[PDB]
């Protein structure tokens, strides 16, 4: 039954028992229920009035932290001879590339959230002259819209795409993207295929497609080359979460799938998640005096 829980539960004092037919420490794991044995039933307890808050494990607080989702470096230079990100890049938006954010999200089967996006830009001179205060354009290109082909192509005129223009000397650029799934929640895992034929992608719900992020430098090239790094941070907010999952144990291999190998030896090997001890009777950090 649903109830409002702001603090951890109190403990009541308890007496000696010795009641026939009452065995609160016995349980039946086969039912699939977790043990209902209370501490007051296992031991004699005192009264404790418990004031510890539980707000820091709220799902909103657990997930609504800004985390790196994308990082791209490209040369800001005259590109006429290059073969390369020619003062712009395109990124196909995903949550799977950086493992710390990926593992937290993959604790759940379904998520509904709005995404707070922070864009941080940094510049370095190619191997010094000072650093230019460049203007950047980020443009969101939804599904079926055309991506830019050049730094100066007319796609950047952004008649109906959302664009943000920001300087390097500004605070990081920030926007919110709404929850935009064609379903009521994102499918964090998808035991299915994307297309009506048999060759479609396994494991990616088509319903969750966000689109492309296109970032250009708006300035014409200078006489000298710079390296520009763009970092994108996502913070989920207004979160609903359904069906908690076993956490990832083996290292991630791919953004595209759940494939696994394990580490070569424990911990987090395929044959042994926990590191070994000499025996089930060995206490590894035993206090001795």
């Amino acid at each position: 039954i649903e109830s409002i829980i702001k603090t951890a539960t109190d403990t009541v004092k308890s007496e000696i028992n010795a009641e026939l037919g009452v065995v609160p420490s016995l349980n039946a794991v086969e039912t699939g229920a977790t043990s209902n044995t209370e501490p007051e039933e296992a031991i004699q307890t005192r009264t404790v009035i418990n004031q510890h808050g539980v707000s820091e494990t709220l799902v909103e607080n657990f997930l609504s932290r800004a985390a790196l989702v994308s990082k791209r470096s490209f040369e800001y230079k005259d590109h006429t001879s290059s073969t390369a990100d020619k003062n712009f890049f395109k990124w196909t938006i995903n949550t799977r590339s950086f493992v710390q954010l990926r593992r937290k999200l993959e604790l759940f089967t379904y998520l509904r959230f709005d995404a707070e996006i922070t864009i941080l830009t940094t510049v370095a001179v190619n191997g010094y002259v000072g650093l230019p205060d460049l203007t950047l354009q980020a443009m969101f290109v939804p599904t079926g819209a055309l991506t830019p082909e050049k730094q100066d192509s007319f796609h950047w005129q952004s008649g109906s795409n959302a664009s943000v223009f920001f300087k390097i000397s500004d605070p990081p650029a920030r926007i919110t993207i709404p929850f935009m799934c064609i379903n009521s929640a994102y499918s964090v895992f998808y035991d299915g295929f994307a297309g009506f034929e048999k060759n479609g992608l396994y494991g990616i719900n088509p319903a969750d497609t966000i689109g492309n992020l296109c970032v250009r430098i708006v300035n014409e090239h200078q006489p000298v080359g710079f390296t520009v790094t763009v970092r994108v941070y996502m913070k989920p907010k207004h979160i609903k979460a359904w069906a908690p999952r076993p956490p990832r144990t083996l290292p991630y291999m791919s953004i595209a799938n759940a494939n696994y190998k394990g580490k070569e030896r424990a911990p987090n090997a395929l044959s042994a998640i926990i590191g070994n001890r000499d025996s089930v009777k060995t206490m590894p950090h035993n206090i001795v005096n």
Binding site: V29, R65, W91, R103, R112, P251, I287
Partner: protein, 247 residues
């Protein structure tokens, strides 16, 4: 206009900040909400679900073999069967558990734990075990008449398959730390040890060796504090196809 001045911290990007920010898609209508089974609203609901301990974390236990402990008939009385390291921060039987994995995103913890053991011998197998929790301060007990002085349950195998040992929150401080110094007085919980109270007794046509599965969960007096990056995951390089997202 309004006279104003900027404070320290102006223009910073704090990853835990909490502000409104500009909507990029004006007048967007999100898909109507639909009821879905199994909404979670607090991570403490997850750590209350019991999950298997990797008690047999030994060489020559491979995969699934690490999740059970095998018991045999003994010819000496009062013998030790196994012990469980209780340090959740250091690598051990508790780490890869629902309580364990969620707790490792936090730094401080408080409240009681429950261990449940399910006996998986045959119906004709009989026996009594004693399960002991020793509060911290000394070495892990190696004899039953020492371990018996702590908190314990004596378990008789019967129609109810499973017994709970409560590990009560017995601590001087309000919280413990998930400290890599496991011998720190702010961190060490003490020990769980299992002894024969009687013996495993089986007829000839039962298997002579029987298994326990151990489970752990938090009780609802349990609290977590100070969120951190979990040390369970990391990457040394870009994942496969992460570059291809730029192509």
């Amino acid at each position: 206009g309004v006279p104003t001045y900027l404070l320290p911290g102006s223009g910073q990007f704090l990853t835990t900040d909490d502000h409104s920010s500009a909507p990029a898609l004006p007048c967007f209508n999100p898909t109507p909400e639909m009821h879905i089974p199994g909404q979670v609203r607090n991570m403490l609901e997850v750590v209350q679900v019991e999950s298997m301990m990797e008690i047999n974390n030994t060489e020559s236990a491979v995969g699934m073999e690490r999740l059970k402990v095998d018991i045999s008939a003994l010819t000496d009385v009062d013998q030790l069967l196994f012990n469980i390291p209780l340090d959740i921060q250091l690598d051990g039987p508790l780490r890869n558990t629902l309580v364990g994995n969620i707790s490792r995103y936090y730094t401080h913890w408080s409240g009681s734990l429950e261990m449940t053991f399910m006996f998986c011998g045959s119906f004709m197998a009989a026996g009594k075990l004693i399960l002991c929790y020793t509060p911290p301060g000394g070495s892990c007990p190696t004899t039953r008449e020492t371990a018996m002085l702590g908190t314990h349950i004596v378990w008789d195998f019967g129609l109810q398959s499973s017994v709970t040992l409560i590990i009560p929150w017995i601590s001087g401080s309000h919280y413990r730390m998930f400290n890599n110094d496991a011998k720190s007085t702010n961190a060490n919980v003490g020990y769980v040890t299992c002894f024969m109270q009687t013996n495993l007794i089986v007829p000839s046509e039962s298997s002579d060796t029987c298994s326990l599965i151990g489970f752990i969960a938090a009780k609802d007096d349990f609290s977590l504090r100070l969120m951190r990056d979990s040390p369970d995951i990391g990457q040394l390089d870009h994942l496969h196809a992460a570059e291809a997202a730029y192509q």
